[PDB]
Amino acid sequence: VETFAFQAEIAQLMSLIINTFYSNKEIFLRELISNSSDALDKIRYETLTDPSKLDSGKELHINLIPNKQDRTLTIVDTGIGMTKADLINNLGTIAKSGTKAFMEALQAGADISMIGQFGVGFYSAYLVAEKVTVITKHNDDEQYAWESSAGGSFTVRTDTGEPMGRGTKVILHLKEDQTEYLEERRIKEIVKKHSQFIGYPITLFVE
Ligand SMILES: CCNC(=O)c1n[nH]c(-c2cc(Cl)c(O)cc2O)c1-c1ccc(OC)cc1
């Protein structure tokens, strides 16, 4: 297990997400599904010129898996995935510059729900999660698990035993008071409200 420090601006963005009073928490799901869609577009685009990019899985989809017993909500996609280097470099985002633009925007009237416009929507997972695990497999690398309970650091390790083939899985270990996000009717409402036109099938698993 390797332990990394978040760059200062990311640590500050995370602290802001965790500590700012902001009721409209549900937007985290739209931001994660939007990230899954972008990654799925990327593998789709690569496959248009190289069909073999799909040998690791032809199906392009997003699954939402709540688990009341573990208190987790997991989002799985069969997108391009990330290499170990992408994971370390802020989950493939331009987080340092994005965070600055997000800050400047906040001071100009913007609210937390606009996070995705600054390329750092991933971090909105911390509105509802005490811990986030990102398991990912890209065609050019092995399967890795990134993890962070915030606090200024994240870990990266090799992941084994449940190979995914290709894609990203985001496991949200929910805060005690945010279990509404495990409820079928609540998830469906949020998907319908914010993710109605996503170009990939979104399957909500039942328990
Ligand atoms: C190097 C190519 N890989 C990717 O771009 C990628 N792969 N998986 C993801 C991904 C990231 C998160 Cl946070 C997520 O919730 C879902 C994803 O598929 C992404 C991804 C990375 C950054 C993004 O910034 C908006 C959006 C999606």
Swiss-Prot record:
The UniProt-reported impact of G81D is: Abolishes ATPase activity
Stretches for region Interaction with NR3C1: 1-207
Q: Which residues bind ATP?
A: N35, D77, K96, F122
Q: What is the effect of changing E31A?
A: Strong ATP-binding. Strong interaction with HSF1, HIF1A, ERBB2, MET, KEAP1 and RHOBTB2. No effect on interaction with TSC1
Which of the residues bear the PTM N6-acetyllysine?
Answer: K42, K68
Where on the tree of life does the source sit, at the highest rank?
A: Eukaryota
Q: Which residues form the signal peptide?
A: none
UniProt-annotated location(s): Nucleus; Cytoplasm; Melanosome; Cell membrane
Q: What is known about its processing and modification? A: ISGylated.
What family is this protein classified in?
Answer: Belongs to the heat shock protein 90 family.
Self-association state and partner proteins as the record states: Homodimer. Identified in NR3C1/GCR steroid receptor-chaperone complexes formed at least by NR3C1, HSP90AA1 and a variety of proteins containing TPR repeats such as FKBP4, FKBP5, PPID, PPP5C or STIP1. Forms a complex containing HSP90AA1, TSC1 and TSC2; TSC1 is required to recruit TCS2 to the complex. The closed form interacts (via the middle domain and TPR repeat-binding motif) with co-chaperone TSC1 (via C-terminus). Interacts with TOM34. Interacts with TERT; the interaction, together with PTGES3, is required for correct assembly and stabilization of the TERT holoenzyme complex. (Microbial infection) Interacts with herpes simplex virus 1 protein US11; this interaction inhibits TBK1-induced interferon production.
Domain remark text: The TPR repeat-binding motif mediates interaction with TPR repeat-containing proteins like the co-chaperone STUB1.
Summarizing the function annotation, the protein's role is:
Molecular chaperone that promotes the maturation, structural maintenance and proper regulation of specific target proteins involved for instance in cell cycle control and signal transduction. Undergoes a functional cycle that is linked to its ATPase activity which is essential for its chaperone activity. This cycle probably induces conformational changes in the client proteins, thereby causing their activation. Interacts dynamically with various co-chaperones that modulate its substrate recognition, ATPase cycle and chaperone function. (Microbial infection) Seems to interfere with N.meningitidis NadA-mediated invasion of human cells. Decreasing HSP90 levels increases adhesion and entry of E.coli expressing NadA into human Chang cells; increasing its levels leads to decreased adhesion and invasion.
Q: What is this protein called?
A: Heat shock protein HSP 90-alpha
| Native species | Homo sapiens
Source species taxonomy: Eukaryota, Metazoa, Chordata, Craniata, Vertebrata
Q: Which gene encodes it?
A: HSP90AA1
